[PDB]
Design an enzyme around this catalytic site. Sequence first.
Site, PDB file in Angstrom:
ATOM      1  N   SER A 106     -19.554 -17.103  52.040  1.00 39.55           N
ATOM      2  CA  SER A 106     -20.602 -18.125  52.164  1.00 39.55           C
ATOM      3  C   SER A 106     -20.433 -19.053  53.370  1.00 39.55           C
ATOM      4  O   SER A 106     -20.590 -18.597  54.512  1.00 39.55           O
ATOM      5  CB  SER A 106     -20.737 -18.927  50.864  1.00 39.55           C
ATOM      6  OG  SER A 106     -19.617 -19.743  50.572  1.00 39.55           O
ATOM      7  N   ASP A 188     -29.132 -13.498  45.316  1.00 35.97           N
ATOM      8  CA  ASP A 188     -28.164 -14.578  45.468  1.00 35.97           C
ATOM      9  C   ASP A 188     -28.730 -15.870  44.866  1.00 35.97           C
ATOM     10  O   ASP A 188     -29.820 -16.309  45.241  1.00 35.97           O
ATOM     11  CB  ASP A 188     -27.866 -14.738  46.967  1.00 35.97           C
ATOM     12  CG  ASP A 188     -26.677 -15.627  47.256  1.00 35.97           C
ATOM     13  OD1 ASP A 188     -26.552 -16.685  46.628  1.00 35.97           O
ATOM     14  OD2 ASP A 188     -25.864 -15.259  48.130  1.00 35.97           O
ATOM     15  N   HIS A 225     -24.153 -14.316  44.024  1.00 39.56           N
ATOM     16  CA  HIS A 225     -23.453 -14.869  45.178  1.00 39.56           C
ATOM     17  C   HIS A 225     -21.996 -14.422  45.190  1.00 39.56           C
ATOM     18  O   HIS A 225     -21.500 -13.905  46.201  1.00 39.56           O
ATOM     19  CB  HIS A 225     -23.562 -16.386  45.141  1.00 39.56           C
ATOM     20  CG  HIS A 225     -23.008 -17.054  46.347  1.00 39.56           C
ATOM     21  ND1 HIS A 225     -23.544 -16.872  47.602  1.00 39.56           N
ATOM     22  CD2 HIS A 225     -21.941 -17.876  46.499  1.00 39.56           C
ATOM     23  CE1 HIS A 225     -22.849 -17.583  48.478  1.00 39.56           C
ATOM     24  NE2 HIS A 225     -21.873 -18.199  47.833  1.00 39.56           N
TER      25      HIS A 225
END
EC number: 3.1.1.3
Length: 318
Positions: A106, A188, A225
């Site tokens: 991320s 996500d 995610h």
Amino acid sequence: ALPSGSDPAFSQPKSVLDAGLTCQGASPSSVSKPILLVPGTGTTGPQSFDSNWIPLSAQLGYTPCWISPPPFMLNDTQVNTEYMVNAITTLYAGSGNNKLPVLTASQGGLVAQWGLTFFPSIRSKVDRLMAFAPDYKGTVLAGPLDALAVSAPSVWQQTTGSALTTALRNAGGLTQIVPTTNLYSATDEVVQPQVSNSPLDSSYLFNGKNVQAQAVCGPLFVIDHAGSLTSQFSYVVGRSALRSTTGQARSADYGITDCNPLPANDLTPEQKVAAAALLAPAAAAIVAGPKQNCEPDLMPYARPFAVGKRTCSGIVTP
């Protein structure tokens, strides 16, 4: 044309930056085939990667190294980038003055691309970038004003429209700077938008190898995610990127038979269970972490690229 010339100054003492860098089984100053792992928001290096790319990169023959910018990647993304730039400088020399790969989760990919955009010295030291669910455009789900009207520095910065993401784009940073692979998912639940399989997606870099899982595996394939980092599908793509002679994953190296959303096969049972719970520490860190009501100021090297935006001290000017 990207920023060129001298590197910006560091705001942190070098001793502090050094304390944030660790390698498994080696010193970063004397390491064979390092890979630099850059963690996600709300985590340390081990929290992001103990259950996935630390063991997985070791089994591919790398020495896993990581940074853990305090507190849990919640500080200013520009400070988090200082940790990465210092780590690249150290690992480059420490591995025999050899380029090294960078692998991210991320925010870690935003940090990597920020470093490549604004710190020219590292362009010749990074071989390739393998970014899992990077939020180069931030996310419309960041929610800095949801519940408490204060949020961590880096959460403001990762909000769509932020001065930081604006500056990255305006300085030319949404085009890849080293060979880059971006692996991400339309489902996500942290980073959006990701659904279009196109440059609209937050994880997309122009001329990068942009791999939306649903473009390979179909529109009903679901990985979230955390699974974007930990899945068997993600492992196969990351392995291709790391082995590739072009520096990018190759479409030939994965396909429909790799569409496995569960934790990577080669992880131990303990690692697979930990991988499912990847983001649990992140929620605790955010609750306990620094919070403010404004986006951190851009550092002077980036200010000219977001004129007119609003940060903590006021309107950005050149």
